[PDB]
């Protein structure tokens, strides 16, 4: 390929990982969404907070998948593994699955930056600061504090109110 | 669940079985879209013609998973599997593959009606009629006409010529 | 009369009585609406989105009595029945046999869409998947939803704050 | 009822007597709008005019389902009968049918007048003149001149003209 | 033909019969136009008309020939034959005889949804539904309200008068 | 006919032949569009070009049907023959048969002026002149030089970008 350079090929199979877990991540939001849009659970803001979250990580793939092209790697594709469970529970329990979600993306993002820290990839490590780590960062702090907001709400009518609040 | 009438647990299943072939085409297109974004085959046409393509085959899967929820039957996933190919060669040959996996998503979408009218579901039938057939008729004729033209258009320069009009 | 063509008597008695079942489901919302007015009940949200609906009713009544004049029939009228109950309870009460009363009408209007397909009128099939079945499952999916959270919401406050809510 | 002043039980009795006449009126002009919408018939300006007067009908009795309940009484419906003709004859018939509907009406609004004087109830009475009896005499009176040109315009080429400046 | 799927060769030739049977429809409608622009005739509302009429005949051919297209059938043209009249009589004749027109081609329609149903093609079925069952219904309707107004108004002077209300 | 003067009745006959004419070659153009929008042809200029050729054709006859009432003529009207051909080969086939076709159509128009000329009727040569032969004379000179065109391009890649430049 003319334009690769600098671009390790252990840099590469770690992008092609984090491409596949950026779908999944995106697969399991689409999931909470559509449980939340059940007849016998209908929490409306919970199913748009989850479908933009579903979009957002389509996202986070797409711009992994060009950055493999713009640095002159070959996408690999391997299977998107269907989610854990088929019913996410209250809105407290997805959410608490939600945040391990996002902490077990941002631990293999801090394992990408790792790697291309270790084969002395600056522009890859910039890529990875600029796009993705303070996003995670900050989504996993919403997530939480959403969690301590669901805790304080109580179940039943608090469950109802506190999923009216969610998008604004 | 409080909504669910004249809805058979074959459609539901049969409803499950699209969203994963939807999502499947999905993934297919996706593909195709990185393959010529590589350096190396570089139709920025068929980039953009492909990643437009992927983004509509979501949304199909999505309005079927909406429909699965309005009809109070319950959305299970299964794994989306990875493409059967890694590089589609020319825009000739993924043109191709594609026109086949449209009609392979379409024979599915017919024996998708079939079960509904065999079902007598039909408020189903004008669903899939109303929001799937045509857009299939469509696209088939599309994607004909694409491989049509490329063959008229030869490789190379011509190939180069075709990429540039598709999108307009 | 000069119109009528490919439109079979027991169709046009079935015409006749989906107009007084849609005018019935008129009737019985005009009373749910005013049961919500009552000084001792005061629930607004649910008087107004009854009323709406009673409103909505008297259309679906009045484009079959169309339908009817466009294909040649003539319509013929019966008494409105006044509704099962003069109270309808809580607004967990009055959703619950609104869910009952749309069902009962999604029955009968699959009944006269088998009814057209066995008399071979595609035309009124059409009229019935265009007009009625989706806007049936909307409507029945609706109100499931909203007896899913009159239930979280419990009674008392939670039936106030889900009344605020109901209509936007 | 914690509203509930000088209102005698006659009274609410007579309003909810009132409101199935208003319903009752109702009925009948959407009889005669799809009369006048047959093939065989087909005179859009009665069809058009009987269609607003239905509309006009079903209002005069959502006013008294909300006075019924501002005032504090419990509204009690009865069924709407079925108008006494199925086909209304020439647009004259039709109009001589709707002279003598508004009449029995006015009559009825005035007996409830009478009740509301009788009762001392002047808030009522003012309701009655202000929203419904000078409506009553402008339509009878309405009614009324169109019956004289309707026989001054004559049958056959005349009742089609006079047809046409129903509306404007 | 690469994009051809379910497209059953009896229903090729149907729509290939239906495309020439909207072509005579437009010659027809044509005819009568030319016979209402006669200096000794000059009725300027039906030459409108007819004139409107035969364009429409002319698309509804056309969106036959591109559906051919689209489903990868062949389009066959035969001869357009010359109205069975050079004269058509009064505007009375002529709705009269447009009327029949309007049947015969309806029946045409209902034989080729029954042609693909009975081959299972429902996205032919819904395409014939959508864009050609209610507008023929809507068209035999229009039709016949206008034979009943024309005897309505009689010979002469009410001939005149229902021709300048034809259009508006 | 009142308003009939100096119209010869062979003129009257070879307006109705010329009639016949212009809607034959709107025919021819409708056949080659069609022809053009084959999945396994797939132009779309061509198709655009014959669409809008076969509706200009169709506007040349009914100003003719229309000259002919003005001057108190009667049309009468023939059958409009199908096309020599149900396939129309490469573009520039194509191309040279609407040649051809515009020639005989010439051919044609120049005779019926020498007819009008012969039969003293001043007012049908102008008809003809400012209506007819310049915009032949210019549709004739087109086609030509798209002609000279199609051999300059050459088969293949020359007549995909050929067609291309069709419309603008
Ligand atoms: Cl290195
Ligand atoms: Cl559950
Ligand atoms: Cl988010
Ligand atoms: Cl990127
Ligand atoms: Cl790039
Ligand atoms: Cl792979
Ligand atoms: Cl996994
Ligand atoms: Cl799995
Ligand atoms: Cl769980
Ligand atoms: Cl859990
Ligand atoms: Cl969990
Ligand atoms: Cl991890
Ligand atoms: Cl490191
Ligand atoms: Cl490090
Ligand atoms: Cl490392
Ligand atoms: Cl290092
Ligand atoms: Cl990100
Ligand atoms: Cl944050
Ligand atoms: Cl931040
Ligand atoms: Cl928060
Ligand atoms: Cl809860
Ligand atoms: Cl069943
Ligand atoms: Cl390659
Ligand atoms: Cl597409
Ligand atoms: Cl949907
Ligand atoms: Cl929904
Ligand atoms: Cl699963
Ligand atoms: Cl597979
Ligand atoms: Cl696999
Ligand atoms: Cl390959
Ligand atoms: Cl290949
Ligand atoms: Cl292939
Ligand atoms: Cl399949
Ligand atoms: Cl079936
Ligand atoms: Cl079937
Ligand atoms: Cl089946
Ligand atoms: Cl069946
Ligand atoms: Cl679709
Ligand atoms: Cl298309
Ligand atoms: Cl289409
Ligand atoms: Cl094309
Ligand atoms: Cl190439
Ligand atoms: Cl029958
Ligand atoms: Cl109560
Ligand atoms: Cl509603
Ligand atoms: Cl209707
Ligand atoms: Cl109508
Ligand atoms: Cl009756
Ligand atoms: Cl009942
Ligand atoms: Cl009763
Ligand atoms: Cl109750
Ligand atoms: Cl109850
Ligand atoms: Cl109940
Ligand atoms: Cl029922
Ligand atoms: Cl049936
Ligand atoms: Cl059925
Ligand atoms: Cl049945
Ligand atoms: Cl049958
Ligand atoms: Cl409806
Ligand atoms: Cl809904
Ligand atoms: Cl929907
Ligand atoms: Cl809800
Ligand atoms: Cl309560
Ligand atoms: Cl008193
Ligand atoms: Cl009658
Ligand atoms: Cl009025
Ligand atoms: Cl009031
Ligand atoms: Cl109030
Ligand atoms: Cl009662
Ligand atoms: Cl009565
Ligand atoms: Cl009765
Ligand atoms: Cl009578
Ligand atoms: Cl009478
Ligand atoms: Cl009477
Ligand atoms: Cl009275
Ligand atoms: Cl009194
Ligand atoms: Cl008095
Ligand atoms: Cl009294
Ligand atoms: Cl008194
Ligand atoms: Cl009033
Ligand atoms: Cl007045
Ligand atoms: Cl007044
Ligand atoms: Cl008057
Ligand atoms: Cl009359
Ligand atoms: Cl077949
Ligand atoms: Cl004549
Ligand atoms: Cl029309
Ligand atoms: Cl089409
Ligand atoms: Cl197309
Ligand atoms: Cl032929
Ligand atoms: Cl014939
Ligand atoms: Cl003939
Ligand atoms: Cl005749
Ligand atoms: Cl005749
Ligand atoms: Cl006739
Ligand atoms: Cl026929
Ligand atoms: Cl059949
Ligand atoms: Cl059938
Ligand atoms: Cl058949
Ligand atoms: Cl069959
Ligand atoms: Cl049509
Ligand atoms: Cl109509
Ligand atoms: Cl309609
Ligand atoms: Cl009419
Ligand atoms: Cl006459
Ligand atoms: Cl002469
Ligand atoms: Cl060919
Ligand atoms: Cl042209
Ligand atoms: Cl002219
Ligand atoms: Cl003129
Ligand atoms: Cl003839
Ligand atoms: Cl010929
Ligand atoms: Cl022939
Ligand atoms: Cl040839
Ligand atoms: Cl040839
Ligand atoms: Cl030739
Ligand atoms: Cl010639
Ligand atoms: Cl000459
Ligand atoms: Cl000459
Ligand atoms: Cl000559
Ligand atoms: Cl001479
Ligand atoms: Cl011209
Ligand atoms: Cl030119
Ligand atoms: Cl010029
Ligand atoms: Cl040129
Ligand atoms: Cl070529
Ligand atoms: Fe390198
Ligand atoms: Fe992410
Ligand atoms: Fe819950
Ligand atoms: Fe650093
Ligand atoms: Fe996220
Ligand atoms: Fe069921
Ligand atoms: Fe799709
Ligand atoms: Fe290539
Ligand atoms: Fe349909
Ligand atoms: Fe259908
Ligand atoms: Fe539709
Ligand atoms: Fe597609
Ligand atoms: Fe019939
Ligand atoms: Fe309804
Ligand atoms: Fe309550
Ligand atoms: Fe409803
Ligand atoms: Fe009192
Ligand atoms: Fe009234
Ligand atoms: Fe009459
Ligand atoms: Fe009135
Ligand atoms: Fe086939
Ligand atoms: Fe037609
Ligand atoms: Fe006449
Ligand atoms: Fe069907
Ligand atoms: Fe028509
Ligand atoms: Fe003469
Ligand atoms: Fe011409
Ligand atoms: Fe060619
Ligand atoms: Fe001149
Ligand atoms: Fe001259
Ligand atoms: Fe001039
Ligand atoms: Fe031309
Ligand atoms: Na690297
Ligand atoms: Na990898
Ligand atoms: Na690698
Ligand atoms: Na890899
Ligand atoms: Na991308
Ligand atoms: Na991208
Ligand atoms: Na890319
Ligand atoms: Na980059
Ligand atoms: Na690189
Ligand atoms: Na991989
Ligand atoms: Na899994
Ligand atoms: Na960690
Ligand atoms: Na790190
Ligand atoms: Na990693
Ligand atoms: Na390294
Ligand atoms: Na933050
Ligand atoms: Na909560
Ligand atoms: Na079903
Ligand atoms: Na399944
Ligand atoms: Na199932
Ligand atoms: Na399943
Ligand atoms: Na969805
Ligand atoms: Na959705
Ligand atoms: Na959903
Ligand atoms: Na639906
Ligand atoms: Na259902
Ligand atoms: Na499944
Ligand atoms: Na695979
Ligand atoms: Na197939
Ligand atoms: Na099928
Ligand atoms: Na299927
Ligand atoms: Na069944
Ligand atoms: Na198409
Ligand atoms: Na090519
Ligand atoms: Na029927
Ligand atoms: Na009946
Ligand atoms: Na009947
Ligand atoms: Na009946
Ligand atoms: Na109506
Ligand atoms: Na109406
Ligand atoms: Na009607
Ligand atoms: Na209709
Ligand atoms: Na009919
Ligand atoms: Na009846
Ligand atoms: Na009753
Ligand atoms: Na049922
Ligand atoms: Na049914
Ligand atoms: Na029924
Ligand atoms: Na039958
Ligand atoms: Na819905
Ligand atoms: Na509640
Ligand atoms: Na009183
Ligand atoms: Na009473
Ligand atoms: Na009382
Ligand atoms: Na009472
Ligand atoms: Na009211
Ligand atoms: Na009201
Ligand atoms: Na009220
Ligand atoms: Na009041
Ligand atoms: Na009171
Ligand atoms: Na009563
Ligand atoms: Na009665
Ligand atoms: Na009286
Ligand atoms: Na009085
Ligand atoms: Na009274
Ligand atoms: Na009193
Ligand atoms: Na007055
Ligand atoms: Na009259
Ligand atoms: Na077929
Ligand atoms: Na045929
Ligand atoms: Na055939
Ligand atoms: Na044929
Ligand atoms: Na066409
Ligand atoms: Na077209
Ligand atoms: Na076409
Ligand atoms: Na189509
Ligand atoms: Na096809
Ligand atoms: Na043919
Ligand atoms: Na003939
Ligand atoms: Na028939
Ligand atoms: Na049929
Ligand atoms: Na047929
Ligand atoms: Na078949
Ligand atoms: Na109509
Ligand atoms: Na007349
Ligand atoms: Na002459
Ligand atoms: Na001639
Ligand atoms: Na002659
Ligand atoms: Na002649
Ligand atoms: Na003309
Ligand atoms: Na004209
Ligand atoms: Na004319
Ligand atoms: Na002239
Ligand atoms: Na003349
Ligand atoms: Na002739
Ligand atoms: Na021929
Ligand atoms: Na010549
Ligand atoms: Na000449
Ligand atoms: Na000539
Ligand atoms: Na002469
Ligand atoms: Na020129
Ligand atoms: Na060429």
Excluded at 48 to 55: I, M, N, P, R, T
Excluded at 70 to 75: A, E, F, L, P
Excluded at 113 to 140: G, R, W
Aim: net charge negative; aromatic share 10%; proline share 2%.
């Amino acid at each position: 390929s003319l334009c690769r350079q600098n671009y390790h090929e252990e840099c590469e199979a770690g992008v092609n990982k984090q491409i596949n877990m950026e779908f999944y991540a995106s697969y399991v939001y689409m999931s909470m969404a559509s449980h939340f849009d059940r007849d016998d659970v209908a929490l409306k803001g919970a199913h748009e907070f989850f479908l933009k979250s579903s979009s957002e990580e389509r996202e986070h793939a797409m711009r992994l998948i060009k950055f493999q092209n713009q640095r002159g790697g070959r996408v690999v594709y391997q299977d998107i593994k269907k989610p854990e469970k088929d019913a996410w529970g209250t809105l407290t329990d997805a959410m608490q699955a939600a945040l391990d979600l996002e902490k077990h993306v941002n631990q293999a993002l801090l394992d990408l930056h790792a790697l291309a820290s270790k084969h002395n990839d600056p522009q890859m490590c910039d890529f990875i600061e600029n796009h993705y780590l303070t996003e995670q960062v900050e989504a996993i702090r919403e997530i939480s504090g959403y969690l301590t907001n669901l805790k304080r709400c109580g179940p039943g009518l608090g469950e109802f109110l506190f999923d009216k609040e969610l998008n604004s």
